[PDB]
Design a protein around this ligand. Sequence first.
Ligand SMILES: [Co+2]
Ligand SMILES: [Co+2]
Ligand SMILES: [Co+2]
Lengths: 164, 162, 162, 141, 141, 141
Amino acid sequence: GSTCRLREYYDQTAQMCCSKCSPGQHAKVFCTKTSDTVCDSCEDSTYTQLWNWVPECLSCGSRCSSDQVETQACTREQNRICTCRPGWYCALSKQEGCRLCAPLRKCRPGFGVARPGTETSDVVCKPCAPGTFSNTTSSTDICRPHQICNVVAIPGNASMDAVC
Amino acid sequence: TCRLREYYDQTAQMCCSKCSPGQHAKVFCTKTSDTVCDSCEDSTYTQLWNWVPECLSCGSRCSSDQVETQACTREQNRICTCRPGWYCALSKQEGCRLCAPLRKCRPGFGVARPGTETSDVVCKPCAPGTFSNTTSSTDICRPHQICNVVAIPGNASMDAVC
Amino acid sequence: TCRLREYYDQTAQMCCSKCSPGQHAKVFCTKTSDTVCDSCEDSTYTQLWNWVPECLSCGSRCSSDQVETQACTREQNRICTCRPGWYCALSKQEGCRLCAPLRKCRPGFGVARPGTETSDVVCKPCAPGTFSNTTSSTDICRPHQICNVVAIPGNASMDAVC
Amino acid sequence: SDMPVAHVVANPQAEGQLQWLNRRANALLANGVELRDNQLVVPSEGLYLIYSQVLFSGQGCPSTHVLLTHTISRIAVSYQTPVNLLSAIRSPCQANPWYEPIYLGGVFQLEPGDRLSAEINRPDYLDFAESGQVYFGIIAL
Amino acid sequence: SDMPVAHVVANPQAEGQLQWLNRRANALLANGVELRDNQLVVPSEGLYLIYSQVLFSGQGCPSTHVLLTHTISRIAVSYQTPVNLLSAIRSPCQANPWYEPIYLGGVFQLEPGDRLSAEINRPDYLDFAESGQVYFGIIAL
Amino acid sequence: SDMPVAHVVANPQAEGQLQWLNRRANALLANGVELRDNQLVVPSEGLYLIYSQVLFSGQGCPSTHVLLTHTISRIAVSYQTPVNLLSAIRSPCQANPWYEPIYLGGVFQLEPGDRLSAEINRPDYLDFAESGQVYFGIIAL
Ligand SMILES: [Co+2]
Ligand SMILES: [Co+2]
Ligand SMILES: [Co+2]
């Protein structure tokens, strides 16, 4: 046999189907041949996010580190999640959320933002295709087309705008 | 409950003699015989009235720039301290493990508080009216010499001039 | 006592055949049957007669700047070596694990001790009367040119002038 | 002993990745413990000693912050998501060679069918030069 | 089983200190082992496996050479003062982040009433981000 | 118990070398396990937990790249040469103090007469300041 209801597992000690506990609580007293499972709600800063029969709830991670925002509170049914604030990306990802936050790289003079930065990937920097420039050190500013002119005084490089 | 210098042996089920500092338990007591104690051997010790099977290992020799202020005996471990002019960077259960030099308070800063014990010196900028033209681990921000007529003003690096 | 190339299996209470280098014991002898030996499979080996359950893993491929001087076979482990001009900064059980470029002795310095394939070059300042005007991992401090009348004395870095 | 045991090791050839093997000398996979999809499957309930070592190495230091992690996670029948049992991080860099070993070990209760995995964030820094450097083990106490 | 056993973990909500907890998933405190004044209290004579791991992490390196020490010490009934059983020290500094793991473990014979404690010199450098990073455990063999 | 058990420590006076001692408080050599020629000798067949830690330290970083190595090796009756069971490497350098812990630990099947050594490449860097920094041990499960 060993085929049980949904929200039930087969407790081998009791040789019978037993009800699981719900997200938000842990198994307090296990299955017996006579009575069923005895569940209890999770207490201080603890949780369970699945139907379970674990003896105690998981530990909510510590509070969010500097330059981080908590985008999800530790509840009885979910762990605390911390995210990087705008301008920062996630250097080192965690099981869920971000462990370490870093400042978005800067695209120096001559280099233009290739692709923007998400919360999981930094910004990619690389020079401009012939005919464009960037005299700005930015993590957002992209290569702009050279000025346009009748009199091409000084030709434009990827680092300075053309002169007229 | 037992007498002092005695303990209750779970196995023998009675009060047996504890060994003295400098000796360890060589043979444990029985319903018939008491504790057989024995002297600690080379570089080994026990400082408490005990009943351990062997003695505690004495630490190694003191490191560079350190003095041995207490010899490894049979009744006590070896203690190492820093020479004068130094402090303890990393404490040991007893003594000091790593020694470091006391910070030097440069020209512009003065010795807030010393501590040739177990804390580095505390440097601090000189508050207006004081100075220090000295890179010392002792000297402090001494007040400016307020002249009758001020020639060269006062900075935290040099004293006023008359 | 058993024959050489045999061993006394404590369990079977008898002498049993050993497996030759290059193979291992698939199944251990019994009271009624002798040991069963299987050749070592991919990237694995044994070098002595034995009765090990499975063969030993050959080491990963040689790192860069290294050269394989012995191939991993059923009977021997891989061995990696440092190419000329390099010494072995770290010796593996059998061979080299980390290779390193031989040190160079700047001008004013010379080769005190050449480069063993397990020791870096040792440099030494050119003793007065000798000089080295080259950055070399082999060149030594040669003696100054001797003369009748010395125009420029000559130092650790440059020859004498006359 | 008749006790479930396992001490798998890294495949020295499978460079770039971390594949646990058992059919090697001084390796163990016995008494019910299975090795499926690169993970160890607990055969029975009971207290277990779980352990694992990985050894990273590199020639130089690229970015201003290379980070290496090592984790043994549990997927419990009684709670079906990876849960971190043991976890360490290490930072080699802030062209001399560098070496970084991480050790994880502890005692945990496990149920028949539980799955154990020992994974890293940077297999490309795994060092299999010599044996005994990278391993994963469980034994039923 | 009926063997004394403990695997306690760091309270992530007790920043700035090291407070061991047992009422957690994948944590143990049973069969006689007591937890009083943050120390483990042995139930019975026997050979114990004692282990512990701490994780240190800092953002940068202060003007002082920072040193990190981790020690499991014993207060035997047969010798009433802390005596170091297992111990290590580490040096992260010699604003890029650093992480420093420390593992301690070995088999020791303990006696009923023995107190075991796992301390650190720098609690303010402890890392509680994920689980399985800071723990302390024993098990009678 | 009557299980072959061993927890030998380093001789604090034997500087420049690593000599294992058993006749000390909080050390063990028992039930058949012998200490001959500085290796541990296995009394009986079985599954053994084998572990070891060493601690290196230094005042500064020499003109070279210093590579510390710690290795527990086994000479089996069925394969008479040291074979690496547990191995790690550490590198403190790339005049402040530095400390380098290495821990090796795993479960192995050993036969009677097998000898286990716990060696290091640079005995001149060991740190015996306190107890429980350097150790080598086994226990039959
Ligand atoms: Co509850
Ligand atoms: Co004696
Ligand atoms: Co085969």
